[PDB]
Amino acid sequence: EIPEVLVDPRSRRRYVRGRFLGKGGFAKCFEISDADTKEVFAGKIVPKSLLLKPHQREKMSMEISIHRSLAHQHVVGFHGFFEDNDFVFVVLELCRRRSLLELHKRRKALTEPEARYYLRQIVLGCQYLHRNRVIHRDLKLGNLFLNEDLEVKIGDFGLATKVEYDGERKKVLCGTPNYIAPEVLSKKGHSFEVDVWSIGCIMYTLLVGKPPFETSCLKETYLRIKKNEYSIPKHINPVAASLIQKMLQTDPTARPTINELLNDEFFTSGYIPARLPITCLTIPPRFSIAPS
Ligand SMILES: C=CCn1c(=O)c2cnc(Nc3ccc(N4CCN(C)CC4)cc3)nc2n1-c1cccc(C(C)(C)O)n1
Numbered sequence: 001e002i003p004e005v006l007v008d009p010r011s012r013r014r015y016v017r018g019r020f021l022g023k024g025g026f027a028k029c030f031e032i033s034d035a036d037t038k039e040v041f042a043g044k045i046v047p048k049s050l051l052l053k054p055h056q057r058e059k060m061s062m063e064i065s066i067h068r069s070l071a072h073q074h075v076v077g078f079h080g081f082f083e084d085n086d087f088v089f090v091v092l093e094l095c096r097r098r099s100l101l102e103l104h105k106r107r108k109a110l111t112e113p114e115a116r117y118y119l120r121q122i123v124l125g126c127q128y129l130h131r132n133r134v135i136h137r138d139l140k141l142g143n144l145f146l147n148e149d150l151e152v153k154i155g156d157f158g159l160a161t162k163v164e165y166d167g168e169r170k171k172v173l174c175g176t177p178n179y180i181a182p183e184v185l186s187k188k189g190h191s192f193e194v195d196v197w198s199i200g201c202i203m204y205t206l207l208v209g210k211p212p213f214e215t216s217c218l219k220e221t222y223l224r225i226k227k228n229e230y231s232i233p234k235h236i237n238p239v240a241a242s243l244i245q246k247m248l249q250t251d252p253t254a255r256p257t258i259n260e261l262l263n264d265e266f267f268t269s270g271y272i273p274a275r276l277p278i279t280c281l282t283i284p285p286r287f288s289i290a291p292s
């Protein structure tokens with residue numbers, strides 16, 4: 001049973017357990033608030049009872065050690081971690097506007113400048129991660145959180161990995177990513193190109209309003225990722241569709257690096273709003289010059 005109040009004995013801090021946010025893996029997420037500073041955060045509470053096997057305990061440590069080394073405007077802030085007899089608690093930045101998945105749920109297909117707006121911040125954050133030699137490996141709508149200003153914050157570093165040397169090919173991804181890259185499925189080894197693939201899939205879902213490889217059978221969805229079986233609707237811009245085609249290639253050595261993306265015609269030749277109206281959560285924005 002999760003405690004009503006959580007206390008860290010090294011930093012001397014008390015966080016009051018509040019609203020249930022979401023359930024991921026073993027973890028339960030609750031909005032927690034510091035007794036003294038009156039600051040609210042997102043709290044990831046994992047039960048030790050489900051961390052008895054050292055393999056699962058090591059995963060949690062790897063996830064924390066990776067997340068704590070990350071400081072960026074487009075990454076979910078890390079404020080700490082602590083533990084007790086039965087639980088592991090992680091203290092992270094709380095984004096009150098939830099995640100792009102909620103936005104996708106209500107809004108489905110988004111306007112082209114809205115996608116250009118978010119994709120820029122998803123890339124900027126991922127650029128930071130790749131500069132620090134971190135592969136997220138599970139980039140999806142549900143872990144791209146939005147703060148009050150609707151700026152993207154990447155979170156959920158459970159499937160993340162640090163690249164220890166030049167040209168390293170990770171042979172094992174223990175876990176199941178949402179936008180799983182073909183090299184993961186075919187077990188040929190993988191590197192940074194798996195994140196560009198996820199970004200390509202995310203781009204498709206924001207512009208089209210459904211995932212590129214969604215089938216009833218997830219195993220038949222995997223067959224499609226392998227065969228490169230997708231079709232971009234013809235109502236989608238030929239510049240945006242050309243970027244999706246670049247990012248969704250079975251050959252990882254052919255996908256643009258996280259650094260070349262902001263320099264694609266899709267970004268450089270299109271309107272990228274400086275900020276989005278909070279109405280865009282509910283209503284599609286028109287982006288007009290003046291109001292009649
Ligand atoms: C702490 C675990 C990972 N995580 C974060 O780092 C994070 C940061 N901000 C947020 N914000 C947030 C706020 C509210 C809500 N909900 C409000 C209640 N609704 C019923 C559903 C949506 C939702 C989010 N939420 C955050 N996280 C979060 C919270 C719930 C579920 C999940 C997943 C599904 C990725 O495990 N992640």
Ligand SMILES: [Zn+2]
Pocket residue numbers: 055174
């Ligand atoms: Zn394993």
